[PDB]
């Protein structure tokens, strides 16, 4: 566990929006995903619309400028870079997935919670109950909650 952000106020910017979803729903999903982590750390997240943010949120398909191409529908859903300058922190979502607010397709909020974990410096957990487990699993709004392992992991980096 190398890089962590050495400041409490972190910015994000949505570079572009998936056509799979309502704009407001993309905004809300991402916002709620950041809140999951601010809930258990001293971190504060603010959305900006211009300039350089710490965490750029991108929807893209195939080769998209960073040596780690996406693979079409299925397989890899998203990836994110650990804390650092430039691409550090950034979270990319595979546009070849079909992003949703619900159980259909791939759930943006759940995926974003996982990716933002990486953006903050977390790796993968071996606990199949943890949001940082390496394989996506759909959990509804009644069931999602950060596992104790996720909480232990993030507080070992920030609190
Ligand atoms: Ca960045
Ligand atoms: Ca994919
Ligand atoms: Ca799509
Ligand atoms: Zn990428
Ligand atoms: Zn991951």
Residue numbers in the entry: 105 to 263
From the study:
pmcA Disintegrin and Metalloproteinase 8 (ADAM8) is a transmembrane protein belonging to the metzincin superfamily of metalloproteases. ADAM8 is activated by autocatalysis in the trans-Golgi network and, for in vivo activity, requires the homophilic multimerization of at least two ADAM8 monomers on the cell membrane. In this context, the binding of a bifunctional ligand to the catalytic sites of an ADAM8 active homodimer on the tumor cell membrane could efficiently reduce ADAM8-mediated tumor growth and invasion to the surrounding tissues. In particular, we chose to dimerize the arylsulfonamido-based hydroxamic acid JG26,14 which has already been reported as a nanomolar ADAM17 inhibitor with a good selectivity over MMPs and ADAM10.
Considering the good fitting in ADAM8, JG26 was dimerized in the P1 position through the insertion of a N,N′-bis(carbamoyl-propyl)-isophthalamide spacer to give compound 1. X-ray crystallographic analysis in MMP-12 cd taken as model metalloprotease and molecular modeling studies in ADAM8 cd validated the design of 1, driving the synthesis of two other analogues bearing linkers of different lengths. Crystallographic analysis showed that the crystal of MMP-12 in complex with compound 1 belongs to space group C2 (cell parameters a = 51.291, b = 60.39, c = 54.00; β = 115.23°). The bifunctional inhibitor 1 (assigned occupancy 0.5) crosses the crystallographic two-fold axis of the MMP-12 homodimer, generating a trimeric adduct: MMP-12–1–MMP-12. In detail, the two hydroxamic acid groups of compound 1 chelate the two zinc ions of the MMP-12 homodimer, thus orienting the 3,5-dibromobiphenyl groups into the S1′ cavities. To verify if this arrangement could also be plausible for the ADAM8–1–ADAM8 trimer, we aligned two ADAM8–JG26 complexes on the MMP-12–1–MMP-12 adduct, maintaining the same N,N′-bis(carbamoyl-propyl)-isophthalamide spacer present in 1. The obtained complex was then subjected to 1.051 ms of MD simulation to analyze the stability of the trimeric complex. After ∼500 ns of MD simulation, the system reached a good stability, with the α-carbons of the two proteins showing an rmsd of ∼3.5 Å and the heavy atoms of compound 1 with an rmsd of ∼5.0 Å, thus confirming a good match between the experimental MMP-12–1–MMP-12 and the theoretical ADAM8–1–ADAM8 3D disposition.
